[PDB]
């Protein structure tokens, strides 16, 4: 009944795939027993929360509700939070403890510098009664100090191999049928999120269960996704090397407003298309990046939409000139 | 194990290393003993809570325990506190030699509201005869005005190469490791001045690779790799800049802001291009690190950055 | 299915007053033992534990082990309403869901019934193990209540050593520093003015006043209290009882 | 340096919890005649001073005259823990920065030693000088207390007249008005139920309802409460002791 992405969710570390490099120190951190603080860092949807919480259910077990302690961004997070909370946690001896207790801190990266350095100064007083794991994003809004006080583990985006074999074993364990473009087009749409990955699987079974047998094809996967086709895009680039103004204005229309397509999904599909031809002189590289990075820009802040599209088509077509 | 910042944390005044100026100064006031109300701002790891810390050691000798009160940011600082507590530790009698006084010393003044740094102004306005004030802050413009005014300002500039460079050979000394010159020279430029991220970076070398070289820094700092941005921001062909940067930096998960600031920290020790030129290739970085901090990251900006960067070194 | 009746009122009613303030919820688990109960506070420093024997009591059937999870405060909002010559009887029936409280005085006819429903937790973790405690000793309650409650302004931590026949007390904070020293005595005419000391390893260790003041508030039950100090283990305070026993296990600080 | 033993501990417990409202910082004088303290309000409206004689102290020491400036809250804490048959010990060493307050029972070894840190005060020392007050007059101290927990609760101020050898109390709030008058007697039988009075010109001042309210609680040191009234001068209040006094200046209000 529940969502696969809470359904899914892994339990035990070898249940996590594309990682081995960090499972495997944690499995000597944990045979060894002289786990430091600890730092997991990385894209979203990769597994940093899985991989903790696995590894506090191996570690402690049953104890696990008591000498583990969650704690989430913004939870009314003054200094007043890290001065009662945390610290009592931390400074609190339990009655029947043997080692240490463990506070884990998802997306602890929405952090003032204040609570920061509160922060830092509470692990640096009580890291001998426990040991803290933080979690983040971006390791580049954290304060120097308290990431040089644990260490690191950068989380490196899932490759095709682990998401392949993961969603076999989601499709063995379902019913459903996927064809062999239907994966290429995910991985390449998905970027390495094993969370969408998992949202927009059951979006699309959801949306064509029709007769129980339906084959996904590659229109329902950019449809729930909300992507375009390379075909389109290859098209509507040769229409604009190509065709006239009129004409390629109305064609880069009709295509983004048929299928509802954003100017910067567009151009990021434009220039990973031109990112792949031969090109004979290079001032024609160098005018085209500018003018479409400008363009992006302005895109960000929200202008008149027919006026950048007309600016992207005139870009691309006063680029190739030599 | 031990944290070698903690263990090689200097304890007398004259061990500390950077600022020659005011670590000489704070020599002469604890010579004297006259010391007024301070704070004490700078940027971070540059050695302010050690200063202040060895400077209230070496001023009180003995006596350390009973006229020194600490306040950092895990404990409590609100309006009771600054009433209450900090008024009766003012007015405490205690017998000193005739120079010394009584010692409060404030961390992270910063985080301290500013009504709670209201209440402080009489406080120590009235009782100063027998207790002065230790403010030590990273930005001293959170501190309100009057008690901006009220105490004599000390900045600590970032520290040197030179000092970072000595202070890693004595703590390499006193620990016989081996190393090389290009290892240190690594840590110099992923520390930036942090004495404390240098020594730390400095200790995880050396307890994960043994030895001290390039490769091992490089790999243990999990950031891009000096040698290959170089490489990029330095390539005669565009196609060339921009296949390294999709290939050896885009796929491994990096993220942007990350690309951006190695390529900033890079281009400001290229000691081999002109000088104008690198100022020109650090304003356009500049401008591409604005543009991702406004929600924008696309692979498009550090492409435009990069033909950018190549169109003025053309 | 379940009939316990007392003796007196007041029994029952210092008994939950004892670790009324400790905990609110609590398991009582009835057997043909008694009753034992068994609970830890939410920072999990403090762990309660209550037996009552089969003598105390004047009526006592049950059939099978019966467990009744029920929050403290309301018991005592039920249980202040009685006098202290009334008894106090627990009904329970099978499938217990609602407890029934009987308070009746055979002076005058006055049937005062209250049920009381029934909020389970499913939490016993009971597990006691050490037995052997390096030092005991055992005071009268009145006076240790004294010292801990005059002990407790000045500071938050209480140090209790055990020297050479030497209890010391000791507490330091900011407004000054206290120091409590009791020597052990026998007095023939009042043993239970009495001082008991036996030591087998000098003990010095320190613990919260809040703990403290939240364990001393049992004092009601008897006049005499026993302490157990044990290094790398938890102290232990035991208040006696005719039929049984309340003890307080404490964790202490570093 | 001193050393004083007090021969039942309840006494300076209710010296310091007689005044410990009025004034948050004291200083205590301690010369080789005894103990001295003055001590002004918060608000420097109502003057409190103490003095206390060696004839009240089982044994007194003073090797040279000291001050000893401390709390009253902390003190009153302190004080606060000692049982009512103990004796009390008063000890302080050369420059005093904390003074040491022994605890020992009389059938027992349990000895119970506080330490209390000593405060700095500027020695703002007044001296007082004696001046023929109009009006002086003593009553219990229980009638008084009554009278002024009566009177407050209708006003912020209480009115005083003597006249004719006549006592009057007057108060006027919002809510209403009240009077209430004494008349000078004596009674072989109880002289602990007798109003003295001795004017040489009838005066009438104004006092605030919160300083008497807070001046009252002096009512557990004595049972018989000293008055002196002058026209312009602070009024004088004084409980006498079995070796000393505890006397409140207060500040009269205007017209
Ligand atoms: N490495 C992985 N192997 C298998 N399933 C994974 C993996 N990473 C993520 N998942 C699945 O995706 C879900 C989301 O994982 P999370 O741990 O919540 O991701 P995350 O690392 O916390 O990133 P955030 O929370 O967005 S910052 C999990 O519950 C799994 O179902
Ligand atoms: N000049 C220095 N010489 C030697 N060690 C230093 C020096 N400056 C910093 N350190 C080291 O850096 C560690 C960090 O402590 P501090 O420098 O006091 O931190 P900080 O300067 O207060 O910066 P904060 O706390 O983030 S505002 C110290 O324990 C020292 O080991
Ligand atoms: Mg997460
Ligand atoms: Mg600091």
Same mark, same amino acid.
């Given at each position: 009944?529940?969502?696969?992405?809470?359904?899914?969710?892994?339990?035990?570390?070898?249940?996590?795939?594309?990682?081995?490099?960090?499972?495997?120190?944690?499995?000597?951190?944990?045979?060894?027993?002289?786990?430091?603080?600890?730092?997991?860092?990385?894209?979203?949807?990769?597994?940093?929360?899985?991989?903790?919480?696995?590894?506090?259910?191996?570690?402690?077990?049953?104890?696990?509700?008591?000498?583990?302690?969650?704690?989430?961004?913004?939870?009314?997070?003054?200094?007043?939070?890290?001065?009662?909370?945390?610290?009592?946690?931390?400074?609190?001896?339990?009655?029947?403890?043997?080692?240490?207790?463990?506070?884990?801190?998802?997306?602890?990266?929405?952090?003032?510098?204040?609570?920061?350095?509160?922060?830092?100064?509470?692990?640096?007083?009580?890291?001998?009664?426990?040991?803290?794991?933080?979690?983040?994003?971006?390791?580049?809004?954290?304060?120097?100090?308290?990431?040089?006080?644990?260490?690191?583990?950068?989380?490196?985006?899932?490759?095709?191999?682990?998401?392949?074999?993961?969603?076999?074993?989601?499709?063995?364990?379902?019913?459903?049928?996927?064809?062999?473009?239907?994966?290429? %087009?995910?991985?390449?749409?998905?970027?390495?999120?094993?969370?969408?990955?998992?949202?927009?699987?059951?979006?699309?079974?959801?949306?064509?269960?029709?007769?129980?047998?339906?084959?996904?094809?590659?229109?329902?996967?950019?449809?729930?996704?909300?992507?375009?086709?390379?075909?389109?895009?290859?098209?509507?680039?040769?229409?604009?090397?190509?065709?006239?103004?009129? @004409?390629?204005?109305?064609?880069?229309?009709?295509?983004?407003? %048929?299928?509802?397509?954003?100017?910067?999904?567009?151009?990021?599909?434009?220039?990973?298309?031109?990112?792949?031809?031969?090109?004979?002189?290079?001032? @024609?590289?160098?005018?085209?990046?500018?003018?479409?990075?400008?363009?992006?820009?302005?895109?960000?802040?929200?202008?008149?939409?027919?006026?950048?599209?007309? %600016?992207?088509?005139?870009?691309?077509?006063?680029?190739?000139?030599? | 194990?031990?944290?070698?910042?903690?263990?090689?944390?200097?304890?007398?005044?004259?061990?500390?290393?950077?600022?020659?100026?005011?670590?000489?100064?704070?020599?002469?006031?604890?010579?004297?003993?006259?010391?007024?109300?301070?704070?004490?701002?700078?940027?971070?790891?540059?050695?302010?809570?050690?200063?202040?810390?060895?400077?209230?050691?070496?001023?009180?000798?003995?006596?350390?325990?009973?006229?020194?009160?600490?306040?950092?940011?895990?404990?409590?600082?609100?309006?009771?506190?600054?009433?209450?507590?900090?008024?009766?530790?003012?007015?405490?009698?205690?017998?000193?030699?005739?120079?010394?006084?009584?010692?409060?010393?404030?961390?992270?003044?910063?985080?301290?509201?500013?009504?709670?740094?209201?209440?402080?102004?009489?406080?120590?306005?009235?009782?100063?005869?027998?207790?002065?004030?230790?403010?030590?802050?990273?930005?001293?413009?959170?501190?309100?005005?009057?008690?901006?005014?009220?105490?004599?300002?000390?900045?600590?500039?970032?520290?040197?190469?030179?000092?970072?460079?000595?202070?890693?050979?004595?703590?390499?000394?006193?620990?016989?490791?081996? *190393?090389?010159?290009?290892?240190?020279?690594?840590?110099?430029?992923?520390?930036?001045?942090?004495?404390?991220?240098?020594?730390?970076?400095?200790?995880?070398?050396?307890?994960?690779?043994?030895?001290?070289?390039?490769?091992?820094?490089?790999?243990?700092?999990?950031?891009?790799?000096?040698?290959?941005?170089?490489?990029?921001?330095?390539?005669?062909?565009?196609?060339?800049?921009?296949?390294?940067?999709?290939?050896?930096?885009?796929?491994?998960? *990096?993220?942007?802001?990350?690309?951006?600031?190695?390529?900033?920290?890079?281009?400001?020790?290229?000691?081999?291009?002109?000088?104008?030129?690198?100022?020109?290739?650090?304003?356009?970085?500049?401008?591409?690190?604005?543009?991702?901090?406004?929600?924008?990251?696309?692979?498009?900006?550090?492409?435009?950055?990069?033909?950018?960067?190549?169109?003025?070194?053309? | 299915?379940?009939?316990?009746?007392?003796?007196?009122?007041?029994?029952?009613?210092?008994?939950?007053?004892?670790?009324? $303030?400790?905990?609110?919820?609590?398991? =009582?688990?009835?057997?043909?033992?008694?009753?034992?109960?068994?609970?830890?506070?939410?920072?999990?420093?403090?762990?309660?534990?209550?037996?009552?024997?089969?003598?105390?009591?004047?009526?006592?059937?049950?059939?099978?082990?019966? /467990?009744?999870?029920?929050?403290?405060?309301?018991?005592?909002?039920?249980?202040?309403?009685?006098?202290?010559?009334?008894?106090? /009887?627990?009904?329970? $029936?099978?499938?217990?869901?609602?407890?029934?409280?009987?308070?009746?005085?055979?002076?005058?006819?006055?049937?005062?019934?209250?049920?009381?429903?029934?909020?389970?937790?499913?939490?016993?973790?009971?597990?006691?193990?050490?037995?052997?405690?390096?030092?005991?000793?055992?005071?009268?309650?009145?006076?240790?209540?004294?010292?801990?409650?005059?002990?407790?302004?000045?500071?938050?931590?209480?140090?209790?050593?055990? /020297?050479? &026949?030497?209890?010391?007390?000791?507490?330091?904070? $900011?407004?000054?520093?206290?120091?409590?020293?009791?020597?052990?005595?026998?007095?023939? &005419?009042?043993?239970? /003015?009495?001082?008991?000391?036996?030591?087998?390893?000098?003990?010095?260790?320190?613990?919260?006043?809040?703990?403290?003041? $939240?364990?001393?508030?049992?004092?009601?039950?008897?006049?005499?209290?026993?302490?157990?100090?044990?290094?790398?283990?938890?102290?232990? =305070?035991?208040?006696?009882?005719?039929?049984?026993?309340?003890?307080?296990?404490?964790?202490?600080?570093?």
């Amino acid at each position: 009944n529940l969502p696969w992405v809470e359904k899914y969710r892994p339990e035990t570390l070898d249940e996590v795939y594309g990682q081995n490099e960090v499972i495997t120190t944690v499995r000597k951190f944990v045979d060894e027993g002289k786990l430091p603080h600890l730092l997991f860092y990385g894209p979203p949807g990769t597994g940093k929360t899985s991989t903790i919480v696995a590894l506090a259910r191996e570690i402690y077990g049953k104890n696990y509700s008591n000498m583990v302690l969650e704690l989430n961004a913004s939870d009314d997070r003054g200094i007043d939070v890290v001065r009662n909370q945390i610290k009592d946690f931390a400074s609190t001896r339990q009655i029947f403890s043997k080692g240490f207790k463990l506070i884990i801190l998802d997306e602890a990266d929405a952090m003032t510098n204040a609570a920061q350095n509160a922060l830092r100064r509470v692990i640096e007083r009580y890291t001998k009664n426990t040991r803290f794991c933080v979690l983040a994003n971006y390791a580049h809004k954290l304060t120097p100090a308290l990431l040089s006080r644990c260490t690191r583990f950068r989380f490196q985006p899932l490759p095709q191999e682990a998401i392949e074999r993961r969603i076999a074993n989601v499709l063995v364990h379902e019913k459903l049928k996927l064809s062999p473009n239907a994966e290429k %087009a995910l991985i390449e749409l998905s970027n390495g999120d094993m969370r969408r990955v998992l949202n927009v699987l059951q979006s699309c079974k959801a949306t064509l269960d029709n007769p129980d047998e339906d084959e996904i094809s590659d229109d329902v996967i950019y449809e729930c996704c909300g992507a375009p086709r390379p075909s389109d895009l290859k098209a509507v680039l040769k229409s604009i090397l190509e065709d006239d103004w009129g @004409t390629a204005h109305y064609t880069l229309n009709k295509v983004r407003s %048929a299928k509802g397509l954003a100017l910067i999904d567009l151009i990021e599909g434009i220039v990973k298309i031109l990112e792949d031809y031969e090109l004979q002189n290079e001032e @024609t590289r160098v005018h085209l990046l500018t003018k479409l990075a400008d363009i992006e820009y302005s895109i960000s802040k929200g202008g008149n939409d027919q006026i950048q599209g007309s %600016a992207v088509i005139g870009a691309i077509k006063a680029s190739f000139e030599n | 194990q031990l944290p070698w910042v903690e263990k090689y944390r200097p304890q007398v005044l004259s061990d500390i290393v950077g600022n020659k100026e005011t670590i000489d100064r704070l020599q002469q006031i604890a010579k004297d003993g006259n010391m007024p109300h301070m704070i004490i701002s700078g940027m971070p790891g540059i050695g302010k809570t050690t200063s202040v810390h060895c400077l209230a050691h070496e001023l009180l000798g003995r006596s350390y325990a009973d006229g020194v009160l600490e306040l950092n940011a895990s404990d409590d600082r609100g309006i009771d506190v600054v009433r209450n507590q900090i008024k009766h530790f003012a007015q405490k009698k205690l017998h000193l030699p005739p120079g010394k006084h009584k010692i409060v010393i404030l961390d992270e003044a910063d985080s301290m509201t500013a009504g709670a740094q209201q209440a402080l102004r009489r406080t120590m306005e009235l009782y100063s005869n027998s207790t002065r004030f230790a403010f030590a802050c990273n930005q001293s413009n959170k501190i309100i005005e009057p008690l901006q005014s009220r105490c004599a300002i000390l900045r600590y500039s970032k520290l040197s190469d030179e000092d970072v460079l000595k202070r890693l050979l004595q703590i390499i000394k006193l620990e016989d490791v081996k *190393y090389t010159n290009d290892g240190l020279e690594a840590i110099i430029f992923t520390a930036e001045g942090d004495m404390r991220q240098a020594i730390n970076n400095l200790q995880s070398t050396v307890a994960g690779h043994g030895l001290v070289n390039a490769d091992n820094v490089f790999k243990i700092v999990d950031s891009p790799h000096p040698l290959i941005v170089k490489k990029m921001l330095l390539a005669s062909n565009l196609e060339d800049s921009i296949q390294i940067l999709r290939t050896d930096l885009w796929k491994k998960g *990096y993220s942007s802001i990350d690309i951006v600031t190695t390529s900033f920290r890079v281009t400001k020790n290229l000691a081999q291009v002109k000088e104008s030129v690198r100022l020109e290739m650090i304003k356009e970085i500049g401008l591409t690190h604005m543009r991702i901090l406004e929600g924008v990251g696309t692979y498009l900006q550090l492409a435009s950055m990069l033909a950018k960067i190549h169109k003025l070194n053309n | 299915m379940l009939e316990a009746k007392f003796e007196e009122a007041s029994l029952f009613k210092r008994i939950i007053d004892g670790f009324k $303030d400790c905990v609110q919820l609590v398991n =009582f688990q009835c057997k043909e033992d008694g009753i034992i109960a068994q609970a830890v506070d939410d920072s999990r420093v403090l762990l309660v534990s209550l037996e009552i024997g089969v003598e105390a009591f004047q009526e006592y059937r049950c059939d099978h082990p019966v /467990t009744l999870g029920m929050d403290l405060t309301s018991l005592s909002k039920i249980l202040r309403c009685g006098n202290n010559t009334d008894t106090l /009887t627990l009904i329970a $029936d099978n499938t217990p869901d609602s407890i029934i409280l009987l308070f009746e005085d055979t002076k005058k006819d006055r049937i005062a019934e209250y049920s009381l429903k029934l909020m389970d937790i499913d939490a016993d973790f009971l597990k006691i193990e050490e037995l052997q405690y390096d030092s005991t000793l055992s005071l009268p309650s009145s006076e240790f209540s004294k010292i801990v409650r005059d002990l407790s302004q000045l500071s938050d931590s209480i140090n209790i050593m055990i /020297t050479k &026949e030497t209890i010391k007390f000791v507490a330091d904070g $900011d407004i000054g520093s206290g120091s409590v020293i009791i020597k052990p005595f026998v007095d023939m &005419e009042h043993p239970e /003015t009495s001082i008991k000391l036996e030591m087998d390893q000098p003990v010095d260790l320190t613990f919260g006043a809040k703990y403290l003041l $939240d364990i001393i508030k049992g004092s009601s039950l008897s006049d005499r209290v026993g302490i157990r100090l044990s290094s790398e283990a938890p102290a232990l =305070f035991q208040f006696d009882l005719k039929s049984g026993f309340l003890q307080f296990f404490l964790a202490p600080k570093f």
